[PDB]
Structure formats: structure tokens, C-alpha cells
Amino acid sequence: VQELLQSEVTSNNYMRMMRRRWNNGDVYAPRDLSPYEMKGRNGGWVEAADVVDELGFSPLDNYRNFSLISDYITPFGRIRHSKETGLKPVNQRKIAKMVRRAIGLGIHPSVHKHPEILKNSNGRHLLPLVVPKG
């Protein structure tokens, strides 16, 4: 069983170096297996188009959504730059303002994601608790 277990680790190790998810219909050439192509020099998993234009929704009218706000703020509660969101300056200003509206209205935290969302994320049972102290 030792050789079987050790082989699995070594096998999974190589699987981590294949930084590509082959799909059906993808055309591949003998060069698509070389290190230069598999090295993944690209250091950015950026978005394609403006999601606010593809979903056709007004952010300012969706300030209630607590998950929509926690998705456009870093874990530290800071609005994400246009590099990450990949939005146009107009739509970025709408989402940037919707986050400030909710935080300013006092319905969403300003330094982290909504508490109810922290209950469904990793570390559910390890969240910082408040001892009554009395």
C-alpha cells in the first residue's frame, strides 16, 4: 500500500504542473505541450467583458444584495480596482458608489464581508467569538 500511496502523491504533483484545462473541441499542436506554453507566464486571470453590461443591471438599485457587495470589496473591506473587476469607468463608478451607499447607509460592514456570509465560508467553526466576560 506504500508504493500505491507514494505513486498517488507523485502523480498529483505532476497534475499541478499542467496549468491548463483541456476541453472538448480544443485544437492542440505539438507546441501546446512544451514548458513555455504550460509555464503560464500570464499572471492574470482577468475578466473578458463588463459584467454590468452583460447582466444588464443597475448596481445602484441592487444595494440590498449583501453578496453583491462582498464580491466587489477585498476581504479588508476595500473596493476592488478596475483591474480586478474589469469594468468600464462608468460601471466601475456605479459599483463603487453602490458599495459606498450600502456601507454609508449602515447595512453592510466596512472592514470585512457580511457576517452571515462569513458563516458560510471556510473556517465556519473557527470564527472569532465574543466571550460574555461576566
Binding site: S110, G123, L126, P128, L129, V130, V131, K133
Partner: protein, 124 residues
């Protein structure tokens, strides 16, 4: 059950290490000056390393390496002690308390606007 805390506050000129209980009550609150450093050596990287080793050593004398099952390491500030004490907890000195760490957080205090800060200095 909230885990124990290992706050490590460090700034340009001194470092503080506080070990509290789940109710956030200090058990070992020491500083660099508690070892004999006077007015300039509390900032050195070496002093922060001896403080961390002294605190961790004091935790063993209190039998806390068997009394604490879950502990949290909190970091406040970016002084020299931020890396000195960590390497103590990440070496042989803190091998007993390393297995009980469940969380690692940062508690550096920032102000969104806030009170006005002191004017810049002209050293030249």
C-alpha cells in the same frame, strides 16, 4: 470556545507581546525593557528575538503548552519585531506551541480619515 491569543505589537522603537485567554485577559504582558534594554536597544531585531524566546519560555514554566489546545497569533504593526517573534514561533523555540495554532490575523490600526496627524518633519 474561543482560542487563546498571542498578540504581537511592534513599532519602530519597541515591541510588546501579550498572551491572553479566551476572554481576552492578559496572562503574560511583557516588553523588551523587561529584559534590561534601555532606551535604544528595545528597537533592535535581536532584543525582539530574546523577548519572544523569553515569553515562550515563560509559557512552558506555566504549563501552557499542555493547557492551550487552540491559540491565535495576532500581529499589530510592522516594526522589526514582526519578523523576529514569528521566527521564534516558527523555529525550535516554539515547536511545542506551534501545533495549537489555528488562526493567524492582523490587527494593525488604520484610520479612514480620522484625526489630523502631526505635520511632516524637516530633518535634512
Amino acid at each position: 470556545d474561543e482560542p487563546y491569543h498571542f498578540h504581537i505589537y511592534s513599532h519602530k522603537h519597541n515591541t510588546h507581546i501579550t498572551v491572553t485567554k479566551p476572554n481576552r485577559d492578559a496572562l503574560i504582558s511583557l516588553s523588551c525593557g523587561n529584559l534590561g534594554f534601555k532606551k535604544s536597544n528595545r528597537k533592535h531585531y535581536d532584543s525582539a528575538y530574546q523577548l519572544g524566546a523569553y515569553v515562550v519560555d515563560k509559557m512552558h514554566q506555566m504549563n501552557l503548552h499542555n493547557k492551550i489546545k487552540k491559540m491565535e497569533v495576532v500581529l499589530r504593526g510592522f516594526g522589526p519585531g514582526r519578523e523576529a517573534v514569528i521566527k521564534v514561533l516558527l523555529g525550535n523555540e516554539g515547536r511545542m506551541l506551534r501545533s495549537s495554532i489555528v488562526r493567524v490575523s492582523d490587527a494593525t490600526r488604520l484610520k479612514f480619515g480620522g484625526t489630523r496627524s502631526k505635520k511632516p518633519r524637516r530633518l535634512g
